[PDB]
Design a binder for this molecule. Structure first.
Ligand code: MFU
Ligand code: CA
Ligand code: CA
Length: 126
């Protein structure tokens, strides 16, 4: 049957890849699009735990697809899927820097809104 490309890891119907190179959020998204995917969306605790345990691993902070670029304080996934699940750090999102793109950081995989021009690794989903 159909499989992920080499170096993409399968999970619950989709393929996942850590992009190690540090880029801005938009640059990370463009790289995912070039590979036929998009930035990671996370729709369940089970998918979050796969991400932190197998994809992110020791990497401390990376971009995912959540963002409020279009409408402040209304976060959406760049890939167009529904926001059915969130895992924010306490008091995030806080739109501190005047922050419209979302990172995962820390061992529990909780999320933070960050300046989009920060260079960080990312995760694509396919
Ligand atoms: C006070 O705000 C928190 O700490 C800052 C260093 C930033 O990482 C910011 O995104 C985060 O929400
Ligand atoms: Ca914002
Ligand atoms: Ca923040």
């Amino acid at each position: 049957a159909v499989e992920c490309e080499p170096s993409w890891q399968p999970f619950q119907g989709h393929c996942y890849r850590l992009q190690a190179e540090k880029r801005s959020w938009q640059e990370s998204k463009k790289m995912c699009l070039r590979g036929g995917g998009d930035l990671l969306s996370i729709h369940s605790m089970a998918e979050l735990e796969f991400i932190t345990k197998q994809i992110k691993q020791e990497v401390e902070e990376l971009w995912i697809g959540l963002n409020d670029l279009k409408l402040q304080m209304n976060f959406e996934w760049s890939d167009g899927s529904l926001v059915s699940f969130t895992h924010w750090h306490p008091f995030e999102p806080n739109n501190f820097r005047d922050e419209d793109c979302v990172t995962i950081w820390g061992p529990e995989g909780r999320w933070n809104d960050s300046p989009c021009n920060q260079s960080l690794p990312s995760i694509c989903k396919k």
